[PDB]
């Protein structure tokens, strides 16, 4: 270290950009008293939020109902579990034509779950492992080499190396003894108990960071890609590779929610840029490993769960590489629906027994309420 | 071309997933009959029976022909030896 004490610099300013430092009043490009490795202001990756995220504001969104816009209460009644933010949220949803129509109140359990880094790491460390090309990690093994299995010269009296059957890992034509094969690489088992938490503490993070945007409908006039860049141009999204992209959780309109993406948008969402149409959900089924001990001795596979989260669910990696998140209400209806029975099962009992009084367990199977959407 | 440039073009045997063992192998039966492990959590004696209780009785001491009848613990120097084969289930 500290070597090369000379010759590393030219004693000359490049006659273009280079520039002296004028004074303390000089506002230097990039400078800031916090150690930020992604120094982005509000003009490069501008947040799509009513207010800029400030320490004062508990969240950069309408904490209250603003009077000049239709307010749409949540699809489901709301309860505030352990980690939730205990602060009401109101996110204005955007018309396709970039206008702001009615504002919609979010669920404080999905979008109100305050972050804590070490419990999205269990999500990220899962993705940075599940997203290897395991089958590429093959490597030749000692036995798999096809060389003579017989010492051609038995070492008896001269100064030859104490070596024979030279198909081991020392020699430039050998292979390892304990090599790396795919069936020896662990794909980690990821519970729904923590995938849900590890998704909710991000889609809140993307709300506290103020990068959360709700759209009425992610539909195009025509399925051509050009119509999807034209849409992005009006909505202002930056699907360029370098400008931070967009993460569409396409769930359909407010009244026609659907999991299978709008066929119009799906074909139009194939732009070479930075964008990733993910599935409108945060849960995924229980993991299982049918080849638990050794049952199937021919599987190629990794070790661990034989039911990995697919590549297009909402993960931690593509949640932090893509600045803005774009959710249609048709997804919010699905997220509140799929996590309702989960949100309720986690309340303490002296609370859980108060629900049917307050109108949370209206069960359309018994007919006490007309069926919800 | 790189690993051996001729050992990897002509093909030998390819290895596959290696089958595991009976993953309750190390509770072998010369303890499932000799000893029994008693105790609350974090103290498990592997109590065993007396050493001399079947071979030679006539003429041995009167009050030592019965020290063979109590469930004595085995001294911990062996507790840790036998219970070592059981810890290995998921080390680290």
């Amino acid at each position: 270290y500290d070597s090369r004490s000379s010759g590393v610099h030219d004693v000359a300013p490049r006659d273009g950009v280079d520039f002296m430092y004028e004074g303390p009043q000089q506002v230097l490009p990039g400078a800031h008293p916090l150690p930020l490795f992604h120094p982005d202001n509000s003009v490069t990756r501008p947040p799509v939020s009513p207010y800029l995220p400030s320490p004062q504001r508990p969240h950069p969104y309408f904490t209250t109902e603003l009077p000049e816009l239709p307010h749409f209460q949540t699809t489901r009644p709301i309860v505030y579990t352990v980690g939730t933010m205990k602060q009401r949220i109101v996110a204005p949803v955007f018309d396709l034509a970039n206008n702001v129509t009615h504002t919609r109140e979010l669920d404080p359990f999905i979008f109100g779950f305050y972050p804590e880094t070490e419990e999205m790491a269990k999500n990220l460390s899962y993705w940075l492992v599940r997203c290897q090309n395991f089958s590429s990690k093959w490597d030749y093994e000692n036995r798999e080499i096809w060389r003579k299995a017989k010492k051609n010269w038995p070492n008896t009296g001269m100064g030859m190396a104490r070596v024979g059957d030279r198909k081991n890992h020392a020699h430039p034509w050998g292979a390892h003894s304990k090599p790396v094969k795919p069936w020896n690489l662990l794909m980690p088992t990821m519970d729904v108990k923590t995938w849900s938490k590890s998704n909710r503490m991000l889609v809140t993070l993307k709300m506290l960071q103020g990068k959360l945007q709700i759209v009425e409908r992610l539909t195009l006039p025509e399925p051509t890609q050009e119509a999807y860049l034209q849409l992005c141009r009006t909505m202002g999204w930056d699907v360029r590779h370098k400008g931070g992209g967009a993460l569409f959780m396409d769930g359909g309109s407010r009244l026609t929610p659907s999991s299978e993406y709008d066929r119009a948008f799906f074909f139009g969402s194939f732009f070479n840029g930075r964008n990733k149409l993910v599935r409108p959900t945060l849960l995924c089924d229980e993991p299982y490993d049918y080849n638990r001990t050794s049952s199937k001795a021919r599987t190629k596979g990794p070790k661990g769960q034989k039911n990995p989260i697919p590549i297009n669910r909402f993960n931690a990696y593509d949640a932090l590489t893509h600045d803005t998140l774009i959710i249609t209400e048709g997804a919010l209806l699905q997220l509140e629906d799929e996590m309702y029975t989960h949100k309720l099962a986690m309340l303490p009992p002296h609370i859980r027994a108060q629900l049917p009084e307050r109108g949370f367990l209206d069960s359309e199977v018994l007919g006490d309420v007309p069926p919800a959407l | 071309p790189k690993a051996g440039c001729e050992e990897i073009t002509r093909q030998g045997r390819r290895v596959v997933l290696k089958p595991q063992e009976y993953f309750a192998q190390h509770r072998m039966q010369v303890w499932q009959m000799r000893f029994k492990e008693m105790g609350p959590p974090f103290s498990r004696v592997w109590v065993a029976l007396g050493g001399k209780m079947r071979r030679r009785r006539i003429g041995r001491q009167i009050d030592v022909k019965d020290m063979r009848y109590y469930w004595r613990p085995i001294e911990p120097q062996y507790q840790r030896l036998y219970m070592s084969r059981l810890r290995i289930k998921d080390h680290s």
Partner: peptide
């Protein structure tokens, strides 16, 4: 299974 022998 075929247990490792």
């Amino acid at each position: 299974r075929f247990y490792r022998p």
